[PDB]
């Protein structure tokens, strides 16, 4: 989340947690990391690809629990036109009530 750190460390963190997302269970941690994601998406352009996929896997894990943030995070996608197919599919899967 913190912008001051030398950039490969930032990338490596966003790109590590992705695997933990599918080994462990992160269900209780939605508030600890969604806000840092919605910030760092805006913070600079270099991460707007990799960070968006770090979220995409978290979506795949959490499923229906995630519904509650959709009406909020829809609006973030205007502040910059950040787009990324797998996310864009999965949010629709959630709205139709099937993500199997």
């Amino acid at each position: 989340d913190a912008p001051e750190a030398p950039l490969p460390s930032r990338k490596a963190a966003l790109e590590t947690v992705d695997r933990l997302t599918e080994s462990l269970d992160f269900t209780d941690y939605a508030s600890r990391i969604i806000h840092p994601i919605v910030r760092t998406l805006d913070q600079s352009p270099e991460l707007r690809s990799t960070a968006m996929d770090t979220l995409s896997s978290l979506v795949f894990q959490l499923g229906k629990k995630y519904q509650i943030f959709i009406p909020m995070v829809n609006k973030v996608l205007v502040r910059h036109r950040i787009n990324h197919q797998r996310y864009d599919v999965l949010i629709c899967r959630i709205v139709k009530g099937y993500t199997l």
Binding site: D28, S31, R32, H35, M72
Partner: protein, 695 residues
């Protein structure tokens, strides 16, 4: 580093750049005093009033002092001969605060500064009455040297051209009189009538103001919203006729204070002359004498009201603006005479100047209130049956009047969720909450539920963290049934993990409470937390996390006590081991926790009582070396009062009584010494012969 004020002076001369001086007063105490002393010159001559605040608060931080004098005493004397009377104000606070160091070293330059301003009532220095109304109030005895010379020396300066000298120095004597009364007034009439256009009448405000302590206070009594008692009609007509040419202007603002001073202390003819003087200026002058006199004597006003209420009744229908309405409530505290204002008061707009004191006026007059309850409800209805800040304050106002609503509340949420301007969202939450609080059938319950979830979303959602705080804070037992609902328990669990420690601290309370209602979701979830927190307490290497661990444990135990009874003993064993070997805040939180735990546990506690007595007494004995005697003392009280292990200790730890009674000398804190006294009461009065055996 230690000498940083020479860097700060490249910015603090500009204002946020002053904040390093307040942070310097917060830095200097962590024993760096004689290095952050170098803030003083870097403020005294290099906006500067906001740095001079930190100089004046460094007196507040470093107390009755010797080292401060060779800086503060020297500048506050020697810089005065060219000083701007505005920037001087926190320096005059520094004079008052350095006068509170009332030992041997301060007196000479404080006595100088009071004599200096007194002789200058220099004719040029208008700062004389500013420095005196500070110093004569901020040192509370030896001032009496001034008592006649203060009202005498007005004629040093009252001839010089600045109107704040000619009127302002005169309108101000009563500070001299205050401390002269806490200790004269008769001779003050001679200064008014004969010491002196301008300076004749103003001193006759002052002697009445203080001569008994009831004269001045009509002002602080309104701001919510004898010496010469025989001289009245002469000291009115002659001093007014001499001073009258100054009306059209500071004489107006001094003679506006004569009306209430007369009302409080010298009641009739003077009130006529000074009212003619109030109406000698166009016509909408600051006529608030009307209100201020009404605080003690509403002056038979029924043929006088066409001189002032008719300015209001003229001003309102075609539309200074604030005080106009304020005088009508000060008049009120007459019903059918005020009744016609109920249509024109609307005409000025929506501002709190109108609407807040208009609410105090509608509060005041019971049979007229009910019409404008319906009328003013229709203002806020028409505004939305159809300016973002004013409509937001309109919702805050809907959230403050008690008028006998749903149509509003539903769309208040829609606006709240999108009114991206921070402060709208905060108070729109605090609106929707209280507007729901007043409300079997499904129909009302559905309306509660509808808003309640749509509010709750924001509590986890908002990237402005203190909104997340306030949304949660707005919940209570006042909605407990819907908080027992599972979807909401998920929103709570989501909140229960967070970036912001205080949000987590608030969240745990809710589940702790609901633990008695819907155990199937709540109970296991809580248990998982407990093991996670003991693991943290076992393997944390960090102060910050160890501290927060112990805090959250302690905070939970008493909020759902039935959950801890079944496996206390390893919690307790861990707590002992934390006490046993080391910022003392961690030990403080663990002590507080033993206190709560024992209080909950009851008889169960008996085993570890002595081991705790050993540890806590060794800590109380060492409270010279380790922080906050009082907390260990407080828990010792709980530990006895829970267990009932009463007289046994007095002979078993035979040093107890000497230790407990020395604290009566040493504590220097009445709010904690009383705990030592309480504790002896718990331990029970012991026979002095028993004491003598037990040495």
């Amino acid at each position: 580093x230690x000498x940083x004020x020479x860097x700060x002076x490249x910015x603090x001369x500009x204002x946020x750049x002053x904040x390093x001086x307040x942070x310097x007063x917060x830095x200097x105490x962590x024993x760096x005093t004689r290095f952050y002393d170098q803030l003083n010159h870097h403020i005294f001559e290099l906006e500067r009033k906001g740095g001079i605040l930190a100089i004046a608060s460094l007196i507040g931080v470093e107390g009755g002092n010797a080292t401060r004098i060779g800086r503060f005493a020297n500048y506050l004397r020697n810089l005065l001969p060219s000083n701007d009377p505005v920037v001087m104000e926190m320096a005059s606070k520094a004079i008052g605060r350095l006068a509170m160091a009332g030992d041997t070293f301060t007196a000479e330059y404080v006595e100088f500064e009071v004599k200096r301003a007194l002789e200058w009532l220099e004719g040029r220095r208008h700062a004389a009455v500013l420095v005196l109304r500070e110093l004569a109030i901020s040192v509370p005895t030896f001032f009496f040297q001034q008592v006649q010379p203060f009202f005498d020396n007005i004629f040093v300066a009252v001839w010089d051209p600045k109107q704040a000298i000619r009127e302002g120095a005169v309108a101000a004597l009563r500070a001299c009189l205050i401390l002269t009364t806490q200790r004269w007034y008769r001779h003050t009439f001679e200064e008014a009538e004969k010491g002196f256009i301008h300076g004749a009448l103003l001193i006759l405000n002052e002697l009445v103001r203080i001569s008994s302590m009831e004269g001045e206070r009509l002002r602080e009594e309104m701001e919510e919203i004898x010496x010469x008692x025989x001289x009245x009609x002469x000291x009115x007509x002659x001093x007014x006729x001499x001073x009258x040419x100054x009306x059209x202007s500071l004489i107006q603002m001094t003679i506006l204070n004569l009306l209430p001073r007369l009302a409080a202390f010298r009641p009739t003819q003077y009130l006529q002359d000074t009212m003619n003087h109030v109406l000698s200026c166009e016509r909408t002058a600051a006529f608030q004498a009307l209100g201020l006199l009404s605080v003690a004597v509403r002056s038979e006003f029924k043929v006088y009201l066409p001189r002032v209420l008719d300015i209001i009744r003229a001003a309102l229908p075609p539309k200074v603006d604030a005080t106009v309405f304020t005088c009508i409530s000060m008049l009120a505290r007459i019903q059918q005479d005020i009744k016609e204002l109920l249509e024109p008061m609307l005409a000025v707009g929506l501002s709190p100047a109108l609407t807040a004191v208009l609410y105090d006026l509608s509060r005041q007059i019971p049979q007229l209130k009910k019409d404008i309850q319906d009328g003013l409800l229709k203002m806020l209805s028409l505004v939305l049956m159809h300016d973002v800040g004013s409509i937001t304050l309109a919702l805050r106002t809907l959230g403050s009047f008690e008028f006998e609503l749903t149509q509003f509340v539903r769309h208040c949420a829609d606006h709240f969720l999108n009114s991206e301007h921070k402060e709208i969202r905060m108070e729109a939450a605090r609106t929707c909450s209280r507007l729901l609080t007043p409300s079997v059938s499904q129909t009302a319950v559905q309306v509660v539920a509808d808003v309640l979830s749509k509010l709750l979303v924001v509590g986890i959602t908002d990237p402005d963290p203190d909104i997340r705080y306030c949304v949660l804070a707005s919940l209570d037992e006042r909605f407990d049934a819907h908080l027992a609902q599972a979807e909401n328990l998920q929103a709570l669990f989501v909140a229960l993990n967070d970036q912001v420690f205080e949000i987590r601290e608030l969240a745990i309370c809710t589940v702790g409470r609901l633990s008695s209602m819907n155990p199937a979701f709540v109970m296991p979830f809580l248990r998982k937390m407990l093991i996670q927190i003991l693991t943290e307490l076992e393997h944390s290497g960090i102060g910050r996390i160890k501290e927060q661990s112990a805090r959250m444990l302690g905070h939970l135990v008493s909020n759902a006590p039935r959950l801890i009874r079944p496996y206390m003993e390893p919690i307790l064993k861990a707590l002992i081991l934390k006490l046993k070997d080391p910022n003392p805040g961690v030990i403080n939180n663990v002590l507080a926790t033993i206190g709560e735990l024992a209080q909950v546990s009851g008889l169960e506690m008996r085993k570890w009582v002595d081991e705790l007595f050993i540890i806590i007494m060794d800590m109380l004995q060492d409270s010279s070396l380790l922080a906050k005697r009082q907390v260990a003392l407080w828990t010792l009280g709980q530990l006895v009062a829970s267990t009932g292990y009463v007289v046994e200790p007095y002979r078993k730890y035979p040093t107890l009584l000497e230790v407990l009674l020395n604290f009566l000398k040493t504590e220097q804190n009445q709010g904690t010494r009383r705990e030592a006294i309480r504790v002896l009461g718990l331990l029970g009065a012991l026979d002095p012969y028993k004491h003598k055996v037990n040495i």
